[PDB]
PDB file of C-alpha atoms in Angstrom:
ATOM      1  CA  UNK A 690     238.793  19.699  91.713  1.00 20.33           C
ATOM      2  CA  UNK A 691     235.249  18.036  92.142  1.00 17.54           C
ATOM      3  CA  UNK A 692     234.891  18.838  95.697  1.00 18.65           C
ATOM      4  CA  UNK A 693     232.583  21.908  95.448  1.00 15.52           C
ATOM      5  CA  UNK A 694     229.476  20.257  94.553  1.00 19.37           C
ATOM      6  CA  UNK A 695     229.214  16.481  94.849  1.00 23.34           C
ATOM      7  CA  UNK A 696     228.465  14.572  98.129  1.00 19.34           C
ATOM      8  CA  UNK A 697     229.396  11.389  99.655  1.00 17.07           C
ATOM      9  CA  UNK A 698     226.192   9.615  99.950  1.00 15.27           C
ATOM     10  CA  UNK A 699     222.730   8.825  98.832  1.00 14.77           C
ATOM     11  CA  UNK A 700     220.908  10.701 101.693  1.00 14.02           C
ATOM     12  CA  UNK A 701     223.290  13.841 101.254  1.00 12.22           C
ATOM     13  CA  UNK A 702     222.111  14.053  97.594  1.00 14.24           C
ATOM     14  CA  UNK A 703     218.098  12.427  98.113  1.00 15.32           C
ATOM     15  CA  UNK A 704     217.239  14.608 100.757  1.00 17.26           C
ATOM     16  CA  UNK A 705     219.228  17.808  99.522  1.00 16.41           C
ATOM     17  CA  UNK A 706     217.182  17.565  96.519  1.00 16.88           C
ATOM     18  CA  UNK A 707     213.906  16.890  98.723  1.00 16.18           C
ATOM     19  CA  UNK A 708     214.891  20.214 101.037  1.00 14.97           C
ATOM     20  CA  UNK A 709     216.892  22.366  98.863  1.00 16.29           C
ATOM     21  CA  UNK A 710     217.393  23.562  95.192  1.00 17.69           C
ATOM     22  CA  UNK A 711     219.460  20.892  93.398  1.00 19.54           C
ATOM     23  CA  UNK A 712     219.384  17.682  91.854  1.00 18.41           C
ATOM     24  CA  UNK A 713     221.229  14.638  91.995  1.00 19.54           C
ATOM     25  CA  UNK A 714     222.401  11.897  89.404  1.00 17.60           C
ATOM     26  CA  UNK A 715     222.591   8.221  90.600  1.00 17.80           C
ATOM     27  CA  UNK A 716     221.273   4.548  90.096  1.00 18.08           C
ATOM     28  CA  UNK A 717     217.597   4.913  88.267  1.00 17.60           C
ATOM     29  CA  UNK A 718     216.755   1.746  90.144  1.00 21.19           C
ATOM     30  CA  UNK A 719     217.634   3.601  93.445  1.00 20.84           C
ATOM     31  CA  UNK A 720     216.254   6.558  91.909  1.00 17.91           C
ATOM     32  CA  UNK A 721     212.792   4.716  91.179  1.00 16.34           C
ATOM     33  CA  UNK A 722     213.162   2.616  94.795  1.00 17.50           C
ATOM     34  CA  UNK A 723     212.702   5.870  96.176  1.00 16.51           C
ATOM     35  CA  UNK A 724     209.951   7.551  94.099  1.00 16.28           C
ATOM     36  CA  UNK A 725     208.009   4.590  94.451  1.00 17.52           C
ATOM     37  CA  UNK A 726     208.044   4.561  97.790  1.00 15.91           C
ATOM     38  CA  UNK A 727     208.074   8.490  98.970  1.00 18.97           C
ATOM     39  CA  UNK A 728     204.731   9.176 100.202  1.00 15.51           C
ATOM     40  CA  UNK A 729     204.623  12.509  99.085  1.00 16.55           C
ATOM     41  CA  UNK A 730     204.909  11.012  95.242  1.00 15.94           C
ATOM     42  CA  UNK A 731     207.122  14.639  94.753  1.00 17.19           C
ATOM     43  CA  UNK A 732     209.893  13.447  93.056  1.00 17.43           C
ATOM     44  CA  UNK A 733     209.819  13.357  89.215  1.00 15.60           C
ATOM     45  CA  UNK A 734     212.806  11.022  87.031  1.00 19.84           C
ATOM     46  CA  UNK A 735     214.573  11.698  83.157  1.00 19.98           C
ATOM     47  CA  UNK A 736     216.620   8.975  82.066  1.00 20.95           C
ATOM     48  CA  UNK A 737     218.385   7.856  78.844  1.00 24.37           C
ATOM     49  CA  UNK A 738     218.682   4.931  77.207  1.00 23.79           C
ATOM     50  CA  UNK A 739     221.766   3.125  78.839  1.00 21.50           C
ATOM     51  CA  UNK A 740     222.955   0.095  76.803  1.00 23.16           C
ATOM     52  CA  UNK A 741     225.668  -2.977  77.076  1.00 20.98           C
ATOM     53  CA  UNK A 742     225.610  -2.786  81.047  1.00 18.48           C
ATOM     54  CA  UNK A 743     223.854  -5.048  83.593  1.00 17.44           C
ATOM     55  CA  UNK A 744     224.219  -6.335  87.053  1.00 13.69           C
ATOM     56  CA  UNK A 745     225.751  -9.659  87.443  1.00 11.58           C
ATOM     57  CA  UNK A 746     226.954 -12.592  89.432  1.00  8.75           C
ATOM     58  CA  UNK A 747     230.919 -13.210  90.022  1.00  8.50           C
ATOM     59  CA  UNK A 748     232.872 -16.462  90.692  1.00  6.53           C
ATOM     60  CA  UNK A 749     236.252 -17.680  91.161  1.00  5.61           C
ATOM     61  CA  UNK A 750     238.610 -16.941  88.276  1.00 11.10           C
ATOM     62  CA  UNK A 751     238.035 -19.808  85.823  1.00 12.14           C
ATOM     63  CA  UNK A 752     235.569 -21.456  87.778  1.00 10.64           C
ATOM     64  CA  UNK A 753     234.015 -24.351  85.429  1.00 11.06           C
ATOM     65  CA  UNK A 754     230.367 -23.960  86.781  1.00  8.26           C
ATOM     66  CA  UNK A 755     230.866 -20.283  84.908  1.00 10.97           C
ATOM     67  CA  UNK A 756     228.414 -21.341  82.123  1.00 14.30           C
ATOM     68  CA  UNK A 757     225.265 -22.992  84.518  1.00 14.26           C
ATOM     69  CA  UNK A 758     224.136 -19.859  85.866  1.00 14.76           C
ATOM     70  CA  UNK A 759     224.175 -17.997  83.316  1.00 12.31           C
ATOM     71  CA  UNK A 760     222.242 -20.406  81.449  1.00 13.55           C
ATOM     72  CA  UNK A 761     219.535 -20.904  84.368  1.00 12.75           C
ATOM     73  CA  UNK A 762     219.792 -16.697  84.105  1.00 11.41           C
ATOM     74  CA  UNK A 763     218.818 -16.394  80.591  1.00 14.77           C
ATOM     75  CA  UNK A 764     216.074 -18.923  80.842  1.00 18.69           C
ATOM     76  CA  UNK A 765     214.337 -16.584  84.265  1.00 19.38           C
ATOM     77  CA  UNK A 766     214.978 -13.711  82.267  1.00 18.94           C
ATOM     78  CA  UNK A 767     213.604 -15.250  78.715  1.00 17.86           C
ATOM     79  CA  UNK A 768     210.592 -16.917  80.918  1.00 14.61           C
ATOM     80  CA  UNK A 769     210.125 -13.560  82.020  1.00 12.65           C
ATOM     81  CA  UNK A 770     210.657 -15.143  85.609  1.00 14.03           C
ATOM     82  CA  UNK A 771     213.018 -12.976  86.723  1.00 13.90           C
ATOM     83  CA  UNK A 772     210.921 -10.048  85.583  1.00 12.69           C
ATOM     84  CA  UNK A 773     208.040 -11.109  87.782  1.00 12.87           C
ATOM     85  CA  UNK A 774     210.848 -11.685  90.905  1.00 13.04           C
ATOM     86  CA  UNK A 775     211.550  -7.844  89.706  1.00  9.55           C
ATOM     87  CA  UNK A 776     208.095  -7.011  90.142  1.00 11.05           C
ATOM     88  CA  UNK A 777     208.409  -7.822  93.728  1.00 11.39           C
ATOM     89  CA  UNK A 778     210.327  -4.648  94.225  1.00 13.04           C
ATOM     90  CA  UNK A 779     209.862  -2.255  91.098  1.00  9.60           C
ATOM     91  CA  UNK A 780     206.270  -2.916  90.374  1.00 10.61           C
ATOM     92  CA  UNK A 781     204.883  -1.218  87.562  1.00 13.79           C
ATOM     93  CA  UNK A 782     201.155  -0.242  88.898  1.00 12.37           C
ATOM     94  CA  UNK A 783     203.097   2.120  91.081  1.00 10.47           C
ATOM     95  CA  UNK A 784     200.488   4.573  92.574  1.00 12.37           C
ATOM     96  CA  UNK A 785     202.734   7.705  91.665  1.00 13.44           C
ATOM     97  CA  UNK A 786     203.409   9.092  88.471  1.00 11.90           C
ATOM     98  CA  UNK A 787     206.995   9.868  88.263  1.00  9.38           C
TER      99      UNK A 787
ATOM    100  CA  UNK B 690     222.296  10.521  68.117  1.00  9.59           C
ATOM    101  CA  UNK B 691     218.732   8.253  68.475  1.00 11.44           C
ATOM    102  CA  UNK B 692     219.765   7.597  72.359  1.00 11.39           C
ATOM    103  CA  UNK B 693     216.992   9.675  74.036  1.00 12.81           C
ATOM    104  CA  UNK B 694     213.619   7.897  73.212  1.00 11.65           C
ATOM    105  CA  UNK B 695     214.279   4.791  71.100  1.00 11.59           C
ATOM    106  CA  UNK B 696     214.121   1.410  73.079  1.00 12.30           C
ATOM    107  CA  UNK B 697     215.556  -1.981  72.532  1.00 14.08           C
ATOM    108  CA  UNK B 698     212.493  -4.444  72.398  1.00 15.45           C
ATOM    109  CA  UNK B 699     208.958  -3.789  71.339  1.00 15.63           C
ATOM    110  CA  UNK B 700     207.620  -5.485  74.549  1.00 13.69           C
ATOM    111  CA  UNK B 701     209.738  -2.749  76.424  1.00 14.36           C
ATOM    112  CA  UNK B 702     207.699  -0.313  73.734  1.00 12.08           C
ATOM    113  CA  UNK B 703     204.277  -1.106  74.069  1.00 11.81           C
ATOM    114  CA  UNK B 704     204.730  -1.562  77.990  1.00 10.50           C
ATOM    115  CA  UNK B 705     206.132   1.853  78.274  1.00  6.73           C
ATOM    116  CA  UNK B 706     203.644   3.187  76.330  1.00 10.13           C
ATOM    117  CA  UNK B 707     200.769   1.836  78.977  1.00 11.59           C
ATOM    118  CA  UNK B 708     202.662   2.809  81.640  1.00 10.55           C
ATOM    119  CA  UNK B 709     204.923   5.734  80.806  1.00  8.52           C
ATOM    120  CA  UNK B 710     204.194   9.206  78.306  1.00  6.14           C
ATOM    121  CA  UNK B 711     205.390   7.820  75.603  1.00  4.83           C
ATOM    122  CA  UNK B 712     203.638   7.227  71.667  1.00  4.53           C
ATOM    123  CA  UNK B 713     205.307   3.818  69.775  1.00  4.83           C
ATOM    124  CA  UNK B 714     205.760   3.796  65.746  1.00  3.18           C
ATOM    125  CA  UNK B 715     205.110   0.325  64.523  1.00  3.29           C
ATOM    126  CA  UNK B 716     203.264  -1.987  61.833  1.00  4.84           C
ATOM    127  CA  UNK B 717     199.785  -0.715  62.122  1.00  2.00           C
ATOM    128  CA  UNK B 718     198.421  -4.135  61.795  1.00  2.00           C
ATOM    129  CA  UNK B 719     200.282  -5.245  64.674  1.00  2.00           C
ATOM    130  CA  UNK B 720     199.062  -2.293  66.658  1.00  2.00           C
ATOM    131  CA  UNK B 721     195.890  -2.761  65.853  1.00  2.00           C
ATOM    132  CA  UNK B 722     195.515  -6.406  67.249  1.00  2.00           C
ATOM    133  CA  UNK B 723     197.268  -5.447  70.221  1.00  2.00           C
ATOM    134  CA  UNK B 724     194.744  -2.405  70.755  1.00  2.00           C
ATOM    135  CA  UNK B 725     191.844  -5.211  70.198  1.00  2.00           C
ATOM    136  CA  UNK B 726     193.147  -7.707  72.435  1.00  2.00           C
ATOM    137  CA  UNK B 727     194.720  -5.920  75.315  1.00  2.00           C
ATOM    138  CA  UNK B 728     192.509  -7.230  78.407  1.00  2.00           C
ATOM    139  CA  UNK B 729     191.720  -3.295  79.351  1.00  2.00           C
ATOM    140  CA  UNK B 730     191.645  -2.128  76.052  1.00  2.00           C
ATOM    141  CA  UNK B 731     193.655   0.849  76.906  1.00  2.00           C
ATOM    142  CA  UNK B 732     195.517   1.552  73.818  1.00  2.00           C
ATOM    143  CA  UNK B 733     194.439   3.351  70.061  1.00  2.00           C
ATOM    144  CA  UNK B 734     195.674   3.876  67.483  1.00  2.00           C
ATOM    145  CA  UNK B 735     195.691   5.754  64.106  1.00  2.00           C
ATOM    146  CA  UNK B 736     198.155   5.075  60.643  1.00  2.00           C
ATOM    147  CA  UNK B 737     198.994   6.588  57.398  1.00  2.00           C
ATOM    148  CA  UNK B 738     197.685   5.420  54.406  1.00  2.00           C
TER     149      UNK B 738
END
Protein backbone atom coordinates (compact mmCIF):
# COMPACT_ATOMS: atom_id res chain seq x y z
CA UNK A 1 0.00 0.00 0.00
CA UNK A 2 3.02 2.43 -0.68
CA UNK A 3 4.35 2.34 2.73
CA UNK A 4 7.24 -0.16 2.23
CA UNK A 5 9.55 1.95 0.39
CA UNK A 6 8.92 5.68 0.19
CA UNK A 7 9.88 8.23 2.94
CA UNK A 8 8.55 11.35 4.29
CA UNK A 9 11.19 13.80 3.56
CA UNK A 10 14.01 15.11 1.51
CA UNK A 11 16.83 14.18 3.99
CA UNK A 12 15.28 10.57 4.53
CA UNK A 13 15.62 10.01 0.74
CA UNK A 14 19.11 12.53 0.03
CA UNK A 15 21.06 11.06 2.58
CA UNK A 16 19.71 7.34 2.26
CA UNK A 17 20.90 7.51 -1.18
CA UNK A 18 24.31 9.24 0.02
CA UNK A 19 24.73 6.22 2.87
CA UNK A 20 22.90 3.35 1.53
CA UNK A 21 21.90 1.47 -1.73
CA UNK A 22 18.89 3.30 -3.22
CA UNK A 23 17.81 6.14 -5.08
CA UNK A 24 15.35 8.70 -4.80
CA UNK A 25 12.98 10.65 -7.29
CA UNK A 26 12.15 14.34 -6.50
CA UNK A 27 12.36 18.07 -7.72
CA UNK A 28 15.51 18.21 -10.39
CA UNK A 29 15.93 21.75 -9.15
CA UNK A 30 16.30 20.33 -5.55
CA UNK A 31 18.00 17.53 -7.05
CA UNK A 32 20.63 19.92 -8.85
CA UNK A 33 20.57 22.47 -5.51
CA UNK A 34 22.12 19.67 -3.94
CA UNK A 35 24.67 18.29 -6.46
CA UNK A 36 25.84 21.62 -6.95
CA UNK A 37 26.55 22.20 -3.74
CA UNK A 38 27.76 18.61 -2.16
CA UNK A 39 31.36 18.88 -1.76
CA UNK A 40 32.05 15.51 -2.50
CA UNK A 41 30.54 16.24 -6.28
CA UNK A 42 29.25 12.19 -5.78
CA UNK A 43 25.97 12.46 -6.83
CA UNK A 44 25.15 11.92 -10.54
CA UNK A 45 21.27 13.15 -12.13
CA UNK A 46 18.91 11.47 -15.32
CA UNK A 47 16.06 13.47 -16.14
CA UNK A 48 13.39 13.62 -18.91
CA UNK A 49 12.02 16.10 -20.72
CA UNK A 50 9.02 17.45 -18.56
CA UNK A 51 6.69 19.76 -20.55
CA UNK A 52 3.43 22.18 -19.93
CA UNK A 53 4.42 22.68 -16.11
CA UNK A 54 6.08 25.66 -14.36
CA UNK A 55 6.19 27.40 -11.09
CA UNK A 56 4.00 30.33 -10.69
CA UNK A 57 2.58 33.23 -8.79
CA UNK A 58 -1.18 33.07 -7.27
CA UNK A 59 -3.68 35.89 -6.49
CA UNK A 60 -7.07 36.41 -5.30
CA UNK A 61 -9.75 34.71 -7.38
CA UNK A 62 -10.47 37.18 -10.20
CA UNK A 63 -8.12 39.62 -9.14
CA UNK A 64 -7.91 42.35 -12.11
CA UNK A 65 -4.07 42.98 -11.71
CA UNK A 66 -4.04 39.03 -12.98
CA UNK A 67 -2.62 40.10 -16.40
CA UNK A 68 0.47 42.77 -15.09
CA UNK A 69 2.62 40.23 -13.74
CA UNK A 70 2.48 38.00 -15.97
CA UNK A 71 3.28 40.42 -18.53
CA UNK A 72 6.36 41.97 -16.48
CA UNK A 73 7.11 37.82 -16.20
CA UNK A 74 7.32 37.15 -19.79
CA UNK A 75 9.33 40.22 -20.53
CA UNK A 76 12.31 38.92 -17.43
CA UNK A 77 11.98 35.68 -18.87
CA UNK A 78 12.10 36.86 -22.80
CA UNK A 79 15.01 39.48 -21.65
CA UNK A 80 16.53 36.54 -20.34
CA UNK A 81 16.44 38.55 -16.93
CA UNK A 82 15.01 36.14 -15.02
CA UNK A 83 17.46 33.59 -16.33
CA UNK A 84 20.40 35.60 -15.07
CA UNK A 85 18.31 36.07 -11.42
CA UNK A 86 18.34 32.02 -11.96
CA UNK A 87 21.90 32.04 -12.34
CA UNK A 88 22.20 33.35 -8.91
CA UNK A 89 21.30 29.97 -7.59
CA UNK A 90 21.64 27.24 -10.45
CA UNK A 91 24.69 28.53 -12.14
CA UNK A 92 25.80 26.72 -15.01
CA UNK A 93 29.85 26.81 -14.57
CA UNK A 94 29.10 24.49 -11.72
CA UNK A 95 32.50 22.94 -10.69
CA UNK A 96 30.97 19.29 -10.63
CA UNK A 97 29.96 17.27 -13.38
CA UNK A 98 26.73 15.72 -12.57
CA UNK B 1 7.98 8.42 -27.91
CA UNK B 2 10.85 11.42 -28.73
CA UNK B 3 10.58 12.49 -24.81
CA UNK B 4 14.08 11.37 -23.68
CA UNK B 5 16.63 13.66 -25.53
CA UNK B 6 14.76 16.15 -27.73
CA UNK B 7 14.51 19.77 -26.25
CA UNK B 8 12.19 22.63 -26.78
CA UNK B 9 14.43 25.64 -27.96
CA UNK B 10 17.69 25.59 -29.82
CA UNK B 11 19.24 28.05 -27.27
CA UNK B 12 18.35 25.28 -24.62
CA UNK B 13 20.28 22.92 -27.46
CA UNK B 14 23.38 24.48 -28.10
CA UNK B 15 23.71 25.48 -24.27
CA UNK B 16 23.31 21.94 -23.26
CA UNK B 17 25.55 20.87 -25.62
CA UNK B 18 28.51 23.23 -23.97
CA UNK B 19 27.57 22.33 -20.82
CA UNK B 20 25.98 18.89 -20.72
CA UNK B 21 26.98 15.29 -22.92
CA UNK B 22 24.90 15.91 -25.36
CA UNK B 23 25.52 16.20 -29.66
CA UNK B 24 22.68 18.80 -31.42
CA UNK B 25 21.34 18.05 -35.17
CA UNK B 26 20.82 21.32 -36.90
CA UNK B 27 21.38 23.49 -40.21
CA UNK B 28 25.04 23.06 -40.69
CA UNK B 29 25.40 26.59 -41.73
CA UNK B 30 24.01 27.74 -38.61
CA UNK B 31 26.34 25.50 -36.69
CA UNK B 32 29.03 26.50 -38.33
CA UNK B 33 28.78 30.32 -37.49
CA UNK B 34 28.04 29.52 -34.08
CA UNK B 35 31.29 27.22 -33.88
CA UNK B 36 33.20 30.45 -35.47
CA UNK B 37 31.85 32.95 -33.26
CA UNK B 38 31.46 31.38 -29.89
CA UNK B 39 33.90 33.63 -27.64
CA UNK B 40 35.84 30.17 -26.50
CA UNK B 41 35.47 28.51 -29.56
CA UNK B 42 34.51 25.36 -27.89
CA UNK B 43 32.24 23.76 -30.30
CA UNK B 44 32.86 21.63 -33.99
CA UNK B 45 31.26 20.43 -36.09
CA UNK B 46 30.95 18.05 -39.12
CA UNK B 47 27.69 17.59 -41.89
CA UNK B 48 26.55 15.41 -44.62
CA UNK B 49 26.82 16.32 -47.96
Amino acid sequence: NGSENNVLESQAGIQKVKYGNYAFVWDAAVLEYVAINDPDCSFYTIGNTVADRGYGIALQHGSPYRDVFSQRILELQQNGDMDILKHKWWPKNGQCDL
